[PDB]
Scaffold this motif. Structure first.
Motif, short mmCIF file in Angstrom:
data_model
loop_
_atom_site.label_atom_id
_atom_site.label_comp_id
_atom_site.label_asym_id
_atom_site.label_seq_id
_atom_site.Cartn_x
_atom_site.Cartn_y
_atom_site.Cartn_z
N UNK A 1 0.79 -1.26 0.01
CA UNK A 1 0.12 -0.11 -0.10
C UNK A 1 0.86 1.34 0.17
N UNK A 2 1.91 1.15 0.93
CA UNK A 2 2.74 2.37 0.90
C UNK A 2 3.36 2.45 -0.39
N UNK A 3 4.10 1.63 -1.02
CA UNK A 3 4.57 1.59 -2.19
C UNK A 3 3.77 1.99 -3.28
N UNK A 4 2.48 1.77 -3.39
CA UNK A 4 1.68 2.07 -4.38
C UNK A 4 1.26 3.29 -4.37
N UNK A 5 1.03 3.93 -3.25
CA UNK A 5 0.71 5.30 -3.03
C UNK A 5 2.11 6.20 -3.03
N UNK A 6 3.26 5.65 -2.65
CA UNK A 6 4.51 6.51 -2.92
C UNK A 6 4.74 6.70 -4.38
N UNK A 7 4.40 5.66 -5.30
CA UNK A 7 4.80 5.99 -6.80
C UNK A 7 3.59 6.83 -7.31
N UNK A 8 2.24 6.74 -6.68
CA UNK A 8 1.27 7.47 -7.16
C UNK A 8 1.30 8.75 -7.00
N UNK A 9 2.06 9.21 -6.26
CA UNK A 9 2.44 10.79 -5.90
C UNK A 9 2.78 11.47 -7.34
N UNK A 10 2.96 10.64 -8.11
CA UNK A 10 3.54 11.09 -9.64
C UNK A 10 2.57 11.34 -10.40
N UNK A 11 1.36 10.90 -10.05
CA UNK A 11 0.29 10.99 -10.87
C UNK A 11 0.11 9.64 -11.76
N UNK A 12 0.76 8.73 -11.26
CA UNK A 12 0.53 7.40 -12.03
C UNK A 12 -0.79 6.50 -11.61
N UNK A 13 -1.35 5.99 -12.43
CA UNK A 13 -2.48 5.19 -11.94
C UNK A 13 -2.16 3.67 -12.11
N UNK A 14 -2.57 2.70 -11.24
CA UNK A 14 -2.61 1.24 -11.19
C UNK A 14 -3.83 0.72 -11.74
N UNK A 15 -3.88 0.12 -12.77
CA UNK A 15 -4.83 -0.73 -13.45
C UNK A 15 -4.43 -1.89 -13.98
N UNK A 16 -4.73 -3.02 -13.35
CA UNK A 16 -4.51 -4.35 -13.82
C UNK A 16 -5.84 -5.17 -14.21
N UNK A 17 -5.54 -6.21 -14.83
CA UNK A 17 -6.72 -7.08 -15.20
C UNK A 17 -6.62 -8.80 -14.84
N UNK A 18 -7.19 -9.31 -14.22
CA UNK A 18 -7.22 -10.61 -13.83
C UNK A 18 -7.76 -11.61 -14.68
N UNK A 19 -7.50 -12.78 -15.16
CA UNK A 19 -7.99 -14.09 -15.90
C UNK A 19 -8.10 -15.13 -15.08
N UNK A 20 -9.43 -15.60 -14.94
CA UNK A 20 -9.68 -16.89 -14.35
C UNK A 20 -8.97 -16.88 -12.83
N UNK A 21 -9.50 -15.86 -12.33
CA UNK A 21 -8.92 -15.87 -10.95
C UNK A 21 -7.35 -15.76 -10.76
N UNK A 22 -6.49 -15.26 -11.90
CA UNK A 22 -5.23 -15.10 -11.87
C UNK A 22 -4.66 -13.79 -12.61
N UNK A 23 -4.15 -12.95 -12.02
CA UNK A 23 -3.48 -11.63 -12.73
C UNK A 23 -2.97 -11.92 -14.13
N UNK A 24 -3.51 -11.81 -15.38
CA UNK A 24 -3.26 -12.01 -16.65
C UNK A 24 -2.15 -11.03 -17.02
N UNK A 25 -2.55 -9.63 -16.81
CA UNK A 25 -1.85 -8.51 -17.11
C UNK A 25 -1.89 -7.26 -16.24
N UNK A 26 -1.04 -6.48 -16.23
CA UNK A 26 -1.16 -5.06 -15.36
C UNK A 26 -0.67 -4.06 -16.12
#
Length: 141
Positions: A111-136
């Motif tokens: 959480x800290x890391x995500x918000x740490x880099x998110x301070x640059x205006x970056x957005x995290x959006x990944x997609x999971x397939x069959x209950x498994x992260x297929x791509x991010x």
């Protein structure tokens, strides 16, 4: 800044394809893409359409809404085509919230890391397939 004109920064794939052979990738990518609006829809559509020989794709079986983390649902036309071996291809999309909601319990480091880099205006959006992260995907606003 909140705007209606994002811009992808980096894209990577996690979910391997070993267990997803030509048949799997065909059906999955077929219906999955058919249920999308990406600028490559026409491409993937014609591809899977010529690979399978059918213009039937984009069937919605399972539906799951998540107002606060993302969304998810199972779509697959293979069942309607083969009509013998139905396979609901689950596809969910969300940010760190959803990723963690199904990835694990809680992590101050994640959480800290995500918000740490998110301070640059970056957005995290990944997609999971069959209950498994297929791509991010990582947007840069």
């Amino acid at each position: 800044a909140g705007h209606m004109v994002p811009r992808v920064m980096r894209v990577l794939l996690l979910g391997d394809v070993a267990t997803l052979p030509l048949r799997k990738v065909l059906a999955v990518v077929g219906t999955a893409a058919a249920s999308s609006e990406h600028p490559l829809g026409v491409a993937v559509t014609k591809y899977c359409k010529e690979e399978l020989g059918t213009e039937t794709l984009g069937y919605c079986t399972d539906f799951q809404a998540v107002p606060g983390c993302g969304i998810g649902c199972k779509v697959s036309n293979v069942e309607g085509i083969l009509a013998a071996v139905p396979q609901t291809f689950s596809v969910l999309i969300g940010n760190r919230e959803w990723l963690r909601r199904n990835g694990l319990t809680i992590s101050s480091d994640v959480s800290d890391a995500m918000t740490d880099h998110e301070m640059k205006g970056q957005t995290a959006i990944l997609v999971a397939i069959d209950g498994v992260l297929c791509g991010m995907i990582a947007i840069a606003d």
